[PDB]
Amino acid sequence: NMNVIIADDHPIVLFGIRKSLEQIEWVNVVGEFEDSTALINNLPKLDAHVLITDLSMGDGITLIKYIKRHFPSLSIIVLTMNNNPAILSAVLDLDIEGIVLKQGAPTDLPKALAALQKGKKFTPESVSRLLEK
Protein backbone atom coordinates (compact mmCIF):
# COMPACT_ATOMS: atom_id res chain seq x y z
CA ASN A 1 0.00 0.00 0.00
CA MET A 2 0.93 3.69 -0.45
CA ASN A 3 0.69 6.51 2.09
CA VAL A 4 -0.12 9.89 0.55
CA ILE A 5 0.12 13.38 2.07
CA ILE A 6 -2.04 16.00 0.33
CA ALA A 7 -0.97 19.66 0.74
CA ASP A 8 -2.85 22.77 -0.46
CA ASP A 9 -4.28 26.00 1.03
CA HIS A 10 -7.85 25.31 -0.23
CA PRO A 11 -9.99 22.77 1.76
CA ILE A 12 -12.23 21.75 -1.21
CA VAL A 13 -9.00 21.10 -3.21
CA LEU A 14 -7.82 18.82 -0.37
CA PHE A 15 -11.29 17.23 -0.37
CA GLY A 16 -11.03 16.76 -4.15
CA ILE A 17 -7.53 15.25 -4.21
CA ARG A 18 -8.57 12.93 -1.35
CA LYS A 19 -11.90 11.78 -2.87
CA SER A 20 -10.11 11.01 -6.19
CA LEU A 21 -7.87 8.54 -4.25
CA GLU A 22 -10.81 7.06 -2.25
CA GLN A 23 -11.86 4.28 -4.66
CA ILE A 24 -8.20 3.13 -4.86
CA GLU A 25 -7.86 0.36 -2.22
CA TRP A 26 -4.03 0.31 -2.28
CA VAL A 27 -3.83 4.08 -1.41
CA ASN A 28 -4.15 5.22 2.24
CA VAL A 29 -4.42 8.98 3.00
CA VAL A 30 -2.18 10.02 5.93
CA GLY A 31 -2.45 13.85 6.11
CA GLU A 32 -4.04 17.04 4.78
CA PHE A 33 -2.00 20.20 5.36
CA GLU A 34 -3.05 23.79 4.52
CA ASP A 35 0.34 25.46 5.04
CA SER A 36 3.98 24.48 4.53
CA THR A 37 4.85 25.05 8.23
CA ALA A 38 2.37 22.38 9.45
CA LEU A 39 3.51 19.98 6.71
CA ILE A 40 7.21 20.58 7.46
CA ASN A 41 6.68 19.98 11.21
CA ASN A 42 4.67 16.74 10.68
CA LEU A 43 6.94 15.40 7.89
CA PRO A 44 9.44 13.77 10.34
CA LYS A 45 6.66 12.18 12.47
CA LEU A 46 4.79 10.72 9.43
CA ASP A 47 6.04 7.67 7.52
CA ALA A 48 4.75 8.56 4.04
CA HIS A 49 5.59 7.68 0.44
CA VAL A 50 4.10 10.53 -1.68
CA LEU A 51 3.45 14.28 -1.26
CA ILE A 52 0.75 15.59 -3.61
CA THR A 53 1.04 19.38 -3.64
CA ASP A 54 0.49 22.60 -5.58
CA LEU A 55 3.40 25.03 -6.11
CA SER A 56 1.65 27.83 -4.16
CA MET A 57 1.10 26.57 -0.56
CA GLY A 58 8.64 30.49 -7.02
CA ASP A 59 7.86 29.78 -3.35
CA GLY A 60 6.84 26.16 -4.12
CA ILE A 61 10.21 25.50 -5.75
CA THR A 62 11.93 26.60 -2.50
CA LEU A 63 9.62 24.31 -0.47
CA ILE A 64 10.27 21.35 -2.77
CA LYS A 65 14.03 22.16 -2.86
CA TYR A 66 14.07 22.06 0.97
CA ILE A 67 11.98 18.85 1.20
CA LYS A 68 14.41 17.16 -1.26
CA ARG A 69 17.41 18.11 0.93
CA HIS A 70 15.96 16.74 4.21
CA PHE A 71 13.26 14.18 3.19
CA PRO A 72 14.68 12.29 0.15
CA SER A 73 12.69 9.09 0.95
CA LEU A 74 9.51 11.04 0.14
CA SER A 75 8.57 11.54 -3.53
CA ILE A 76 6.57 14.55 -4.78
CA ILE A 77 3.72 14.96 -7.29
CA VAL A 78 3.29 18.59 -8.39
CA LEU A 79 -0.08 19.98 -9.49
CA THR A 80 -0.01 22.99 -11.83
CA MET A 81 -2.41 24.75 -14.24
CA ASN A 82 0.46 26.37 -16.15
CA ASN A 83 1.80 24.24 -19.00
CA ASN A 84 4.54 26.89 -19.64
CA PRO A 85 7.62 24.61 -20.12
CA ALA A 86 9.87 27.37 -18.71
CA ILE A 87 8.30 26.55 -15.33
CA LEU A 88 7.96 22.78 -15.76
CA SER A 89 11.56 22.37 -17.02
CA ALA A 90 12.81 24.00 -13.80
CA VAL A 91 10.39 21.79 -11.82
CA LEU A 92 11.95 18.63 -13.35
CA ASP A 93 15.49 19.95 -12.66
CA LEU A 94 14.62 19.61 -8.93
CA ASP A 95 14.20 15.89 -9.82
CA ILE A 96 10.62 15.39 -8.63
CA GLU A 97 8.69 12.18 -9.30
CA GLY A 98 5.63 13.43 -11.25
CA ILE A 99 3.51 16.27 -12.67
CA VAL A 100 -0.26 16.07 -13.07
CA LEU A 101 -1.97 19.12 -14.57
CA LYS A 102 -4.82 20.54 -12.46
CA GLN A 103 -7.03 20.39 -15.56
CA GLY A 104 -8.04 16.72 -15.28
CA ALA A 105 -5.74 15.99 -12.33
CA PRO A 106 -8.58 13.97 -10.67
CA THR A 107 -8.28 11.46 -13.55
CA ASP A 108 -4.49 11.37 -14.07
CA LEU A 109 -3.60 11.68 -10.34
CA PRO A 110 -4.28 7.94 -9.68
CA LYS A 111 -2.16 7.05 -12.75
CA ALA A 112 0.74 9.19 -11.47
CA LEU A 113 0.73 7.31 -8.14
CA ALA A 114 0.62 3.97 -10.02
CA ALA A 115 3.69 4.95 -12.07
CA LEU A 116 5.54 6.12 -8.91
CA GLN A 117 4.89 2.77 -7.17
CA LYS A 118 6.75 0.97 -10.01
CA GLY A 119 9.74 3.39 -9.86
CA LYS A 120 8.53 5.29 -12.95
CA LYS A 121 8.09 9.07 -13.26
CA PHE A 122 4.85 10.71 -14.41
CA THR A 123 5.95 13.38 -16.87
CA PRO A 124 2.93 14.58 -18.94
CA GLU A 125 2.35 15.08 -22.73
CA SER A 126 3.98 18.56 -22.86
CA VAL A 127 7.43 16.93 -22.32
CA SER A 128 7.56 16.87 -26.16
CA ARG A 129 8.60 20.56 -25.82
CA LEU A 130 11.47 19.58 -23.47
CA LEU A 131 12.40 16.69 -25.84
CA GLU A 132 12.18 19.00 -28.90
CA LYS A 133 14.62 21.22 -26.97
mmCIF file of C-alpha atoms in Angstrom:
data_model
loop_
_atom_site.group_PDB
_atom_site.id
_atom_site.type_symbol
_atom_site.label_atom_id
_atom_site.label_comp_id
_atom_site.label_asym_id
_atom_site.label_seq_id
_atom_site.Cartn_x
_atom_site.Cartn_y
_atom_site.Cartn_z
ATOM 1 C CA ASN A 1 0.000 0.000 0.000
ATOM 2 C CA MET A 2 0.934 3.686 -0.447
ATOM 3 C CA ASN A 3 0.691 6.511 2.092
ATOM 4 C CA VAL A 4 -0.124 9.894 0.549
ATOM 5 C CA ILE A 5 0.121 13.385 2.073
ATOM 6 C CA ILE A 6 -2.036 16.003 0.331
ATOM 7 C CA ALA A 7 -0.968 19.659 0.745
ATOM 8 C CA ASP A 8 -2.855 22.769 -0.463
ATOM 9 C CA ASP A 9 -4.277 25.996 1.028
ATOM 10 C CA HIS A 10 -7.848 25.311 -0.228
ATOM 11 C CA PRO A 11 -9.988 22.772 1.755
ATOM 12 C CA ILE A 12 -12.232 21.753 -1.212
ATOM 13 C CA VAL A 13 -9.000 21.096 -3.209
ATOM 14 C CA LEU A 14 -7.818 18.819 -0.368
ATOM 15 C CA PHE A 15 -11.290 17.233 -0.366
ATOM 16 C CA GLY A 16 -11.030 16.761 -4.152
ATOM 17 C CA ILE A 17 -7.526 15.253 -4.209
ATOM 18 C CA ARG A 18 -8.567 12.926 -1.352
ATOM 19 C CA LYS A 19 -11.901 11.775 -2.873
ATOM 20 C CA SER A 20 -10.115 11.012 -6.190
ATOM 21 C CA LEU A 21 -7.873 8.542 -4.254
ATOM 22 C CA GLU A 22 -10.811 7.062 -2.246
ATOM 23 C CA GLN A 23 -11.856 4.285 -4.665
ATOM 24 C CA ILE A 24 -8.200 3.133 -4.863
ATOM 25 C CA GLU A 25 -7.859 0.364 -2.217
ATOM 26 C CA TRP A 26 -4.026 0.312 -2.281
ATOM 27 C CA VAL A 27 -3.830 4.081 -1.412
ATOM 28 C CA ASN A 28 -4.154 5.222 2.238
ATOM 29 C CA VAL A 29 -4.420 8.978 2.999
ATOM 30 C CA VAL A 30 -2.178 10.022 5.931
ATOM 31 C CA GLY A 31 -2.449 13.849 6.115
ATOM 32 C CA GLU A 32 -4.036 17.042 4.779
ATOM 33 C CA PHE A 33 -2.004 20.203 5.364
ATOM 34 C CA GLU A 34 -3.053 23.791 4.520
ATOM 35 C CA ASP A 35 0.343 25.457 5.043
ATOM 36 C CA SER A 36 3.982 24.479 4.534
ATOM 37 C CA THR A 37 4.846 25.050 8.233
ATOM 38 C CA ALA A 38 2.374 22.382 9.446
ATOM 39 C CA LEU A 39 3.507 19.976 6.705
ATOM 40 C CA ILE A 40 7.212 20.584 7.461
ATOM 41 C CA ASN A 41 6.677 19.984 11.215
ATOM 42 C CA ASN A 42 4.671 16.740 10.677
ATOM 43 C CA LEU A 43 6.940 15.404 7.893
ATOM 44 C CA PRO A 44 9.436 13.766 10.342
ATOM 45 C CA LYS A 45 6.657 12.176 12.466
ATOM 46 C CA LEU A 46 4.792 10.723 9.429
ATOM 47 C CA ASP A 47 6.039 7.667 7.524
ATOM 48 C CA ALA A 48 4.752 8.562 4.043
ATOM 49 C CA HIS A 49 5.595 7.679 0.440
ATOM 50 C CA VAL A 50 4.104 10.533 -1.677
ATOM 51 C CA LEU A 51 3.450 14.283 -1.261
ATOM 52 C CA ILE A 52 0.749 15.587 -3.612
ATOM 53 C CA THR A 53 1.036 19.382 -3.643
ATOM 54 C CA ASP A 54 0.487 22.601 -5.577
ATOM 55 C CA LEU A 55 3.397 25.030 -6.113
ATOM 56 C CA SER A 56 1.652 27.827 -4.158
ATOM 57 C CA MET A 57 1.102 26.574 -0.564
ATOM 58 C CA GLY A 58 8.643 30.486 -7.022
ATOM 59 C CA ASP A 59 7.863 29.780 -3.347
ATOM 60 C CA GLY A 60 6.837 26.165 -4.115
ATOM 61 C CA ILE A 61 10.210 25.498 -5.746
ATOM 62 C CA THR A 62 11.931 26.597 -2.504
ATOM 63 C CA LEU A 63 9.624 24.308 -0.468
ATOM 64 C CA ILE A 64 10.274 21.349 -2.773
ATOM 65 C CA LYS A 65 14.027 22.165 -2.856
ATOM 66 C CA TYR A 66 14.067 22.063 0.972
ATOM 67 C CA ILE A 67 11.983 18.846 1.205
ATOM 68 C CA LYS A 68 14.413 17.165 -1.255
ATOM 69 C CA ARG A 69 17.409 18.111 0.928
ATOM 70 C CA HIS A 70 15.963 16.741 4.206
ATOM 71 C CA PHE A 71 13.261 14.183 3.190
ATOM 72 C CA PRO A 72 14.683 12.293 0.145
ATOM 73 C CA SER A 73 12.695 9.094 0.945
ATOM 74 C CA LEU A 74 9.510 11.041 0.142
ATOM 75 C CA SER A 75 8.573 11.537 -3.527
ATOM 76 C CA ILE A 76 6.570 14.550 -4.777
ATOM 77 C CA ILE A 77 3.724 14.956 -7.293
ATOM 78 C CA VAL A 78 3.293 18.594 -8.395
ATOM 79 C CA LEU A 79 -0.081 19.978 -9.492
ATOM 80 C CA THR A 80 -0.013 22.992 -11.829
ATOM 81 C CA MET A 81 -2.414 24.747 -14.242
ATOM 82 C CA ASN A 82 0.457 26.369 -16.151
ATOM 83 C CA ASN A 83 1.804 24.244 -19.005
ATOM 84 C CA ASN A 84 4.539 26.887 -19.644
ATOM 85 C CA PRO A 85 7.623 24.614 -20.124
ATOM 86 C CA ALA A 86 9.872 27.374 -18.712
ATOM 87 C CA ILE A 87 8.301 26.550 -15.330
ATOM 88 C CA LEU A 88 7.962 22.781 -15.756
ATOM 89 C CA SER A 89 11.557 22.372 -17.021
ATOM 90 C CA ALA A 90 12.809 24.003 -13.803
ATOM 91 C CA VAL A 91 10.389 21.789 -11.819
ATOM 92 C CA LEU A 92 11.946 18.634 -13.345
ATOM 93 C CA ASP A 93 15.493 19.949 -12.655
ATOM 94 C CA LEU A 94 14.624 19.609 -8.932
ATOM 95 C CA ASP A 95 14.199 15.895 -9.824
ATOM 96 C CA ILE A 96 10.621 15.393 -8.627
ATOM 97 C CA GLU A 97 8.690 12.178 -9.301
ATOM 98 C CA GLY A 98 5.629 13.427 -11.252
ATOM 99 C CA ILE A 99 3.513 16.267 -12.667
ATOM 100 C CA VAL A 100 -0.262 16.067 -13.074
ATOM 101 C CA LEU A 101 -1.968 19.116 -14.572
ATOM 102 C CA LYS A 102 -4.824 20.538 -12.458
ATOM 103 C CA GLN A 103 -7.035 20.388 -15.561
ATOM 104 C CA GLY A 104 -8.044 16.722 -15.284
ATOM 105 C CA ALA A 105 -5.738 15.995 -12.334
ATOM 106 C CA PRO A 106 -8.585 13.974 -10.672
ATOM 107 C CA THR A 107 -8.278 11.459 -13.545
ATOM 108 C CA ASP A 108 -4.488 11.374 -14.067
ATOM 109 C CA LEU A 109 -3.602 11.677 -10.342
ATOM 110 C CA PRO A 110 -4.278 7.943 -9.679
ATOM 111 C CA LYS A 111 -2.163 7.046 -12.754
ATOM 112 C CA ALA A 112 0.740 9.187 -11.471
ATOM 113 C CA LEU A 113 0.734 7.310 -8.137
ATOM 114 C CA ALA A 114 0.617 3.972 -10.016
ATOM 115 C CA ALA A 115 3.688 4.949 -12.066
ATOM 116 C CA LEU A 116 5.535 6.125 -8.910
ATOM 117 C CA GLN A 117 4.892 2.766 -7.174
ATOM 118 C CA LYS A 118 6.752 0.975 -10.015
ATOM 119 C CA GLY A 119 9.743 3.394 -9.863
ATOM 120 C CA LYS A 120 8.528 5.286 -12.953
ATOM 121 C CA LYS A 121 8.093 9.069 -13.256
ATOM 122 C CA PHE A 122 4.851 10.715 -14.412
ATOM 123 C CA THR A 123 5.952 13.377 -16.871
ATOM 124 C CA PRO A 124 2.929 14.578 -18.938
ATOM 125 C CA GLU A 125 2.347 15.079 -22.728
ATOM 126 C CA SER A 126 3.982 18.559 -22.857
ATOM 127 C CA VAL A 127 7.426 16.926 -22.316
ATOM 128 C CA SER A 128 7.562 16.873 -26.165
ATOM 129 C CA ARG A 129 8.599 20.564 -25.818
ATOM 130 C CA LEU A 130 11.471 19.577 -23.468
ATOM 131 C CA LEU A 131 12.403 16.693 -25.836
ATOM 132 C CA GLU A 132 12.184 18.999 -28.896
ATOM 133 C CA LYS A 133 14.618 21.220 -26.973
#
